[PDB]
DNA sequence: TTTGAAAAGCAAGCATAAAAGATCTAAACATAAAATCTGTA
DNA sequence: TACAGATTTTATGTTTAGATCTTTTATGCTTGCTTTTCAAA
């Protein structure tokens, strides 16, 4: 515990940066720390997971999905999902595009594809991603003049297919579910530029999830107004028993 | 000009160009060194405007004409909207590079301790040099977000002090992209990365000017440090 | 398992509206579909006098640009503002070639790359308008020999507050070795958002005394005179006009969010608008009522939340001292003309008086409170018309179901939240989030991210993680923990691991390792060390 | 105090900037002119740190010395006193 | 009103993290002559 | 059968994005001595 005065605002953050004396320092580390091997580790981890606090969640889990006709109200408008929160946001979102969104998309505009990325994983990559967009859409492909002189193709087909899908009818040929948006190799600008240029396209559905705490920093007024956001919490202190396969967790 | 000037108002004129010539080189030599081109701009960008300046009693008199038109070479004149939460960021960026952050809790803390616990105490010493002069240091966010919070103006239930919302990140990532502030990495850069720390990327008068813009006085967290 | 993956299709099986049942699940859907389709009406009539203004925007620019294009030394443009988005188009003038040539950053890591890029364009252009050759300036030199006309070229150099400066120094003392052809003429234009003097700092002085011989200076931002604000809100107020009213905090929650943001303020305020309006016609059942033809189908439910209005309540409070769905029906016919008031006094005030530099909004949320002779008190020039203008807004009975208006705090939840402020007050105080309905175990202990965050609130520069795993520890209780790891018989590794004496210090490890990745993962902590990880840092305040 | 104009910061840059052009100042830690066009193309494809920071804070070593002033400056020059230090 | 004493401050030492960049290498982007395929005449 | 034309194979050049390693510089902990502001006589 610290010996501080205050703890919130800067009034604790420059308080509690004390220079702390060198006899008052605890030499401890992780030799008399319990020793543990993986198995018990993952079976501990998975019996709570699976059994402690389970009933709160579930509860909370079914107070939120009364949200998913605003959700779709908000997607219809053109507005790009973002949710953050205490917790994994993975099974929300694959039970809120999978089981209600594009069945009602569907069902409205008379199923609807969804690319799932998974920006937990660092190998994610945009150069992929955009071949299997194409593979989804069909998008023209770019003539001789469109290439200019060693641009990247990828961000001037996407320019394309802005200034082909503003003639289009305004109806959702896909729904893009972004778990992680702050990970590793999906924060990285590039991607970014990507998903942006990406959610101008009124066309497609983009639902989001961010863990960081810093991510709204990775967004500047351009990709901002490209985005387009409207924000929602969903806090639900969920196990996240998939992302943390993808860390080094016995380090 | 001139041809336009002697009807509105050969050699005479050749000793008036001659004259203004001498009168440029010898006002801006110092300025220039022995440079052709730049006195040729000088001489192209104020020739016009001592044109303007010549009267009947001027033009045959070369001491009152140089006194008519003495603020030609007097200076050089070689030259040619931001957001209230990006000024103030960059007034806290400027502050979080320039100031030592041991010194924080001596300068913006205000808060009645209900815990007993003494303050920073200050620092005993006056600098030799400037910090203002030297290159900036490099922060982390929390600090730059913890003065921009001390520093941002102005009841049970209102919470007057400003939290770092979404507007504030946004306005950091525009001030980052405009390059006003600066980091160690410039290509791929991992804005989420703990070991990426920030600086400012502006000098000392362009910041004055931008806190005379918001009334802050930026000058007194400087006037007793060195 | 396609959770290892980095993207997959999924096609669902599949086996239609979005509005929801109001009045607690007694509204009629043909209520929901008048909703829907009146949302969508009000909706496109803003929305169509939105994409005019938009185009009136990129025209207006376009023209002003062609304008001071047109009328040895380059012809320097310097936008301020620019966020460049702009399409320019040049003259199709005859016995010259006009050539638009556009430079980002992106495109310029050197000098080379950038002149290579721009006669490339200019060969490209010049091919298409009507051998190889070598992409250097000598292309330039060799116009009128290979193509028979003159040369106009027009760089726009893309997001110039983000160039190096060096770089674009050197291409303009390239480019100034032009101007020895007779053919050739070169324009320029700057596209900057931060300020003339800060470009002008980073270039040397003798490309600055280059570009002093033919510059001119235009403002391209969207709070140019507010007139591109100020037709979008009245846009609005072309929309909303005789169905809803603003209310004052709204207005004033409108100016405070346009203020904050530089480049994409029109944008900003189109979509604080449209969301308001989203969450009305979400929320409230008597925006049916909105259309004067539904006014028979009132039900029990809608005059039991219609009594429930303090106009309401200050009508019979005073009807009662002095001495219903008639009364409610006959009183829906007033315009409440202080939209056209607004646009009156908008139209007097650029009419004869030449005043342009005021914001509408301003002056429609100081005519909202009423204080709207403190608003024109301040240009002294209007002095003589504080009668002709002078408008007392009248509070209307039951306006507030017809209203327009931010105390629920959803705007500021949606638009624009206090993303970490909220992610640790969820952290700190759990038991909000969560339901309070292992039964003996979710009463006593706190789930393990709020436990930690807790004991994480309350700590120093440097933490020794051992001893802070011992403090997690002494919260937990040993003895339900005990009792609870043994309530899964099927398992029979639990319980041998239960049987052994160090059950409750290996679990409590388990716990906090898995709870500080994943404090690692959101960013709250930091391991200084790359090796070792005996000790942390605390990344992250609340309340900042 | 013992008159001389005193230019002001904005007028010193020009003369700073021929000063720099005159190969009299050299940036701090510059490796100049590359031996091979292989490690020049490689250095032409890299932003120096120096370019990205404004003008008045880069760092620069001098290629003539205090001393060698003192000893070619006239006597009778009338900035002479300030060669020594 | 003093007192003093633990909190704060300053400087030297030194191991170490990190910025800058030198050198290089893969990957996208790009061109091209000879051979091979292919759809008819 | 054959042949004009389209596509592939093999071969190389152009430009961008990122990795790795080295060298020099900031930084962070330790230790000893000096100031100093607020919890008790």
């Given at each position: 515990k610290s010996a501080s005065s205050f703890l919130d605002t800067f009034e604790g953050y420059f308080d509690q940066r004390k220079i702390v004396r060198?006899?008052?320092?605890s030499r401890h580390t992780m030799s008399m720390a319990p020793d543990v091997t993986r198995e018990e580790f993952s079976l501990v981890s998975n019996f709570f997971n699976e059994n402690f606090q389970k009933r709160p969640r579930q509860k909370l889990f079914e107070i939120q999905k009364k949200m998913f006709p605003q959700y779709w109200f908000e997607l219809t408008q053109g507005f790009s999902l973002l949710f953050y929160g205490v917790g994994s946001k993975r099974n929300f979102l694959e039970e809120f595009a999978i089981d209600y969104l594009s069945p009602k998309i569907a069902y409205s505009q008379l199923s609807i594809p969804c690319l799932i990325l998974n920006?937990?994983?660092?190998?994610?990559?945009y150069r992929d991603v955009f071949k299997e967009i194409t593979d989804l859409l069909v998008p023209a492909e770019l003539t001789r003049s469109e290439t200019?002189?060693?641009?990247?193709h990828v961000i001037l087909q996407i320019q394309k297919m802005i200034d082909f899908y503003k003639?289009?009818?305004?109806?959702?040929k896909l729904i893009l579910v972004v778990h992680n948006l702050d990970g590793p190799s999906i924060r990285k600008n590039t991607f970014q530029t990507m998903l942006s240029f990406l959610s101008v396209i009124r066309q497609i559905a983009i639902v989001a999830s961010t863990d960081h705490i810093?991510?709204?920093?990775?967004?500047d007024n351009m990709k901002a107004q490209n985005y387009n956001f409207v924000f929602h919490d969903i806090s639900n202190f969920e196990p996240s028993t998939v992302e943390s396969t993808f860390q080094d967790v016995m380090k | 000009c001139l041809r336009k000037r002697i009807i509105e108002e050969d050699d005479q004129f050749q000793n008036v160009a001659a004259n203004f010539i001498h009168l440029i080189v010898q006002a801006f030599h110092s300025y220039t060194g022995n440079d052709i081109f730049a006195l040729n701009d000088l001489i192209d960008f104020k020739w016009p405007k001592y044109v303007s300046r010549i009267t009947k009693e001027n033009i045959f008199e070369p001491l009152a004409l140089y006194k008519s038109a003495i603020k030609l070479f007097l200076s050089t004149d070689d030259n040619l909207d931001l957001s209230i939460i990006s000024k103030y960021l960059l007034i806290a960026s400027y502050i979080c590079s320039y100031?030592?952050?041991?010194?924080d809790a001596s300068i913006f803390s205000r808060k009645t301790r209900i815990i007993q616990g003494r303050a920073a105490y200050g620092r005993r010493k006056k600098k030799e040099?400037?910090?203002?002069?030297l290159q900036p240091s490099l922060f982390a966010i929390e600090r730059l977000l913890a003065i921009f919070q001390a520093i941002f103006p102005i009841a049970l239930?209102?919470?007057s002090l400003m939290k770092a919302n979404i507007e504030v990140f946004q306005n950091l990532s525009e001030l980052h992209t405009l390059k006003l502030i600066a980091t160690?990495?410039?290509?791929?850069?991992?804005?989420?990365?703990?070991?990426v720390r920030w600086k400012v990327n502006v000098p000392w008068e362009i910041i004055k000017e931008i806190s005379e813009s918001v009334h802050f006085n930026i000058s007194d967290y400087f006037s007793d440090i060195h | 398992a396609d959770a290892q993956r980095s993207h997959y299709t999924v096609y669902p099986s599949l086996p239609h509206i979005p509005f929801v049942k109001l009045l607690s699940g007694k509204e009629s859907e043909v209520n929901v579909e008048k909703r829907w389709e009146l949302y969508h009406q009000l909706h496109s009539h803003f929305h169509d006098q939105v994409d005019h203004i938009i185009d009136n925007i990129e025209a207006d620019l376009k023209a002003e640009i062609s304008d001071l294009l047109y009328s040895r030394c380059f012809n320097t443009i310097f936008l301020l503002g620019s966020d460049s988005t702009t399409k320019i188009e040049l003259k199709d003038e005859s016995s010259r070639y006009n050539v638009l040539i556009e430079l980002t950053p992106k495109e310029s890591p050197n000098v080379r790359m950038m002149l290579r890029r721009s006669m490339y364009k200019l060969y490209s252009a010049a091919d298409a308008e009507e051998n190889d050759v070598s992409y250097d300036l000598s292309l330039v030199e060799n116009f009128k020999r290979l193509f028979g006309k003159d040369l106009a070229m027009v760089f726009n150099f893309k997001d110039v507050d983000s160039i190096n400066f060096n770089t674009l120094d050197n291409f303009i003392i390239l480019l100034?070795?032009?101007?020895?052809?007779?053919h050739v003429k070169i324009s320029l234009i700057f596209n900057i958002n931060t300020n003339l003097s800060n470009i002008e700092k980073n270039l040397r002085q003798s490309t600055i005394r280059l570009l002093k011989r033919n510059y001119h200076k235009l403002d391209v931002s969207?709070?140019?005179?507010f007139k591109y604000g100020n037709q979008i809100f009245q846009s609005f107020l072309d929309t909303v006009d005789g169905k809803l009213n603003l209310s004052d905090r709204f207005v004033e929650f409108i100016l405070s969010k346009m203020a904050?943001?530089?480049?994409?303020?029109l944008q900003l305020l189109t979509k604080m608008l449209d969301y308001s309006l989203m969450s009305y016609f979400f929320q409230n059942?008597?925006?049916?009522?909105?259309?004067?033809?539904?006014?028979?189908?009132?039900n029990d439910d809608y005059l039991k939340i219609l009594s429930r209005c303090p106009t309401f309540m200050f009508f019979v409070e005073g009807l009662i001292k002095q001495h219903l769905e008639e009364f409610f029906v006959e009183?829906?016919?007033?315009?409440?003309?202080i939209n056209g008031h607004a646009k009156f006094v908008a139209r007097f005030l650029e009419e004869?008086?030449?005043?342009?530099?005021?914001n509408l909004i301003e002056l429609y949320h100081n005519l909202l409170i009423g204080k709207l002779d403190s608003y024109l008190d301040?240009?002294?020039?209007?002095?003589?018309?504080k009668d002709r203008l002078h408008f007392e807004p009248i509070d209307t009975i039951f306006q507030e179901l017809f209203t327009l208006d931010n105390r629920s705090g959803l705007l500021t939840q949606s638009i624009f939240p206090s993303y970490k402020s909220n992610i640790e007050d969820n952290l700190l105080s759990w038991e909000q989030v969560l339901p309070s309905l292992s039964g003996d175990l979710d009463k006593i202990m706190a789930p393990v991210l709020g436990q930690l965050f807790k004991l994480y609130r309350?700590?120093?520069?440097?933490?020794n993680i051992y001893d802070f795993y011992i403090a997690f520890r002494e919260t937990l209780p040993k003895e339900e923990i005990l009792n609870f790891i043994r309530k899964?018989?099927?398992?029979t590794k639990l319980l041998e691991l239960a049987e052994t004496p160090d059950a409750f210090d290996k679990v409590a490890l388990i716990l906090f390792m898995q709870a500080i990745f994943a404090f690692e993962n959101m960013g709250?902590?930091?391991?200084?060390?790359?090796?070792?990880?005996d000790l942390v840092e605390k990344c992250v305040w609340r309340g900042i | 105090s013992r008159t001389i104009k005193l230019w002001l910061k904005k007028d010193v840059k020009n003369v700073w900037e021929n000063l720099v052009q005159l190969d009299f100042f050299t940036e701090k830690s510059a490796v100049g002119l590359r031996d091979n066009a292989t490690a020049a193309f490689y250095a032409s494809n890299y932003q120096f740190q120096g370019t990205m920071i404004p003008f008045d804070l880069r760092s620069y070593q001098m290629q003539i010395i205090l001393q060698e002033l003192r000893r070619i400056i006239p006597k009778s020059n009338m900035y002479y006193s300030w060669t020594q230090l």
């Open positions: 060198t006899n008052a320092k920006g937990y994983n660092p190998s994610c990559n200019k002189y060693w641009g990247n003639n289009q009818p305004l109806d959702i810093y991510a709204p920093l990775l967004w | 100031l030592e952050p041991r010194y040099v400037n910090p203002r002069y239930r209102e919470e160690t990495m410039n290509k791929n850069i991992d804005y989420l990365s703990p070991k | 100034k070795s032009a101007f020895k052809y007779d969207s709070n140019k005179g904050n943001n530089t480049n994409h303020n059942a008597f925006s049916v009522f909105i259309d004067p033809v539904n006014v028979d189908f009132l009183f829906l016919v007033r315009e409440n003309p004869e008086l030449n005043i342009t530099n005021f301040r240009w002294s020039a209007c002095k003589e018309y309350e700590a120093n520069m440097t933490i899964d018989p099927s398992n709250l902590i930091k391991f200084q060390s790359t090796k070792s990880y | -």
